[PDB]
Every structure is written in C-alpha cells, then in structure tokens.
Amino acid sequence: ANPLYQKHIISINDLSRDDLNLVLATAAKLKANPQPELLKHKVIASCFFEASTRTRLSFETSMHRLGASVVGFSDSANTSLGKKGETLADTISVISTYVDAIVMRHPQEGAARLATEFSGNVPVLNAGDGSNQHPTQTLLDLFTIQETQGRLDNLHVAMVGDLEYGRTVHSLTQALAKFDGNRFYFIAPDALAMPQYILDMLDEKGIAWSLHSSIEEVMAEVDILYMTRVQKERLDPSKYANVKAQFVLRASDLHNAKANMKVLHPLPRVDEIATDVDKTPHAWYFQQAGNGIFARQALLALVLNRDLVL
C-alpha cells in the first residue's frame, strides 16, 4: 500500500515532506491523465455542517471525476443550540456505517479529529474545522506554486493582508517551512501582524523573513504574491481608508515584477484585487482554484485506493 491508504487527513502538520510530494505528484498525474473510474463503487459523504459552497462544489466535483458516488447535506446557519439532540459523535457513529469515506466541514475546531474517534475504519478528510485546519486548501496552494515555479524550494514568497486571523497563510507558511532556502515577506497593517509562534518557528529553522508595510518594497523580487482578504469589521472604518490603498492591488503595481511571478488568492476577493490584474500573466487565482480539484482528487485517490497508478 501507499503511505496514505486508509489514513485520516486532518491537519497539515500531520504530513511529512514525503507525504506532501506524494500528494502533489498524484495531483500532477491525475491532471495529465484522468482516471474517471478509479473510485467506481465507492460512496463518499459530503458533510457540510457549516455551509461553504465554493468548498463543497470543488470537493464533490473531485469525487465525481474519480467515478465515486456522493451523498450529503449542507447545514443552515445551524439552528438555536445546534443539532441539539445529536452529539456530533453519534452522527459520525451512524454515517460511518453508510459510507466509504467522510468529507466534513464544521464551525467548531477539532470536529474532524473528533470524528476520527467514532468513524471506525472509515477515513475522514477535514474540509475545514472552524479556525484550525483546512488542508486541501493548503495542498491546492502548494500544488499551484510548484506547478508554476517548477520547485518548492528557494522561493521568494510574499504574504499580504489580515495576517493575524488569516489561517490560510499560517498553514501555507508552516508547510513551505518543511522546504529549504525559502524566503518570506509579511505585509500587514500593524495591529494585524503575523502571530509570533510562527516567526519563532521560522527563526528556529533558520528561515529568512522580513516584516514590511507596503507591497512596493518587495514587488521587484518575489516569485509568489499570496493575498488574503482584509475585512471591514476587523479594522474599523476610519483607520481602514487611511491605510487601505496598499493592501489593494492594481495592474500598475506590477511594472517591475518577475516574469515567473504569479499572484495567488484562496478566494473570494472583494476589492483587494482590482479586476485589471485579471488580464495579466501574473493573475493565477482562478487557475489555483482549478487546481483544487486535482489536489482533492489526489487525496481521495491515495486514501481510498491502496496502490497508486502514476
């Protein structure tokens, strides 16, 4: 069997570098040469306790593309005091007797991990557990970077926006740190700077990093510019306008940028990326989104199919 056969996929931190490459290789294989009948006869449960339509669509598309059958549900803001009756445990306890794997998304952190403890030999794949993990987002991010730079080492990577709450970039930073020679740049409105324990983790690994306050300072020399999504509630509406215009990206900010550089963004965006960057060779956020279905196919394939055909 391959290392990931029948394993739960809960947290980025539970994966070696070996693992990561394994996933990314499979993604690239499946993207080159589809296997629309790899999971024929499998039935996967798409369990979105917290609605997330862009996430469900991607994942369910991945399932069909492998020929698997899909059942599931999207929950409705919850209701009053939850499911109220059913413990999450009971819920998994039952569903794990219907299906061959579970993909779940939930507002409480740790829910995915909890499910593993009642799912028997049914693997669960975390599609988002509150503010904790979202591994396929990170995996899709990784795959996208590698595909476009040809490598995941010795890269110049910028992070921009709400770096304090932006779990997307935490995860991507963590996983890029299992790679050598990489160099980070963090761009944030001061009271939103990158949480320390990461930097501590970075210094301790010997990872070059620089805190800045405007995209310009570094634009000329980065390979990936990864933007997150600054909110109108987080910062207040007076300080917002006074410093908002550097956490917004226009094509005119790309005059001195490298011909290999791609701009990434987990989506959705609102105003943080002006639509005029869309037409440039740098915009790669839609491409990135597309790659989600390969990252997710890869993961489902590796977990449910004992030996992989590259």
The residues annotated as belonging to the active site are 54-55, 84, 105, 134
Q: Which of 13, 154, 210, 287 binds a second copy (CB under 8 A)?
A: 287
Which CA distances in Å does 199 have to 147, 154, 210, 259? 27, 18, 10, 29
Which CA distances in Å does 264 have to 100, 176, 283? 33, 15, 7
Q: Does 256 bind a second copy (CB under 8 A)?
A: no
Q: Which of 17, 54, 151, 250 binds a second copy (CB under 8 A)?
A: 54
| Distance of closest approach, residue 183 Cβ to a second copy, in angstroms | 27
Burial 102-119 (b: 16+ CB within 10 A, else e): bbbbbbeeebbbbbbebb
Q: Does 76 bind a second copy (CB under 8 A)?
A: yes
Q: Which stretch binds a second copy (CB under 8 A): 4-12, 20-28, 212-220, 232-240?
A: 232-240
Closest to a second copy by CB, 87 vs 210, is: 87
From the list 170, 146, 116, the residue with the least C-alpha distance to 26 is 146
Closest to a second copy by CB, 37 vs 216, is: 37
Rounded Cα distance between 281 and 2, Å, is 37
Flag whether 55 is marked binding.
yes
Rounded Cα distance between 196 and 152, Å, is 24
Strands of the 101-106 sheet, one edge to the other:
69-74, 43-48, 101-106, 124-129
Q: Does 286 bind a second copy (CB under 8 A)?
A: yes
Flag whether 116 is marked binding.
no
- Strand partners of residue 283: 263
Which residue ranges are tagged as binding site?
54-55, 84, 105, 134, 137, 167, 229, 267-268
Residues making contact with a second copy (CB under 8 A)? 36, 41, 43, 45, 53-54, 56-58, 60-61, 64-65, 69-74, 76-77, 79, 83-87, 90-91, 93-95, 97-99, 131, 164-165, 190-191, 195, 229, 233, 236, 238-239, 267-271, 275, 286-287, 289-290, 292-293
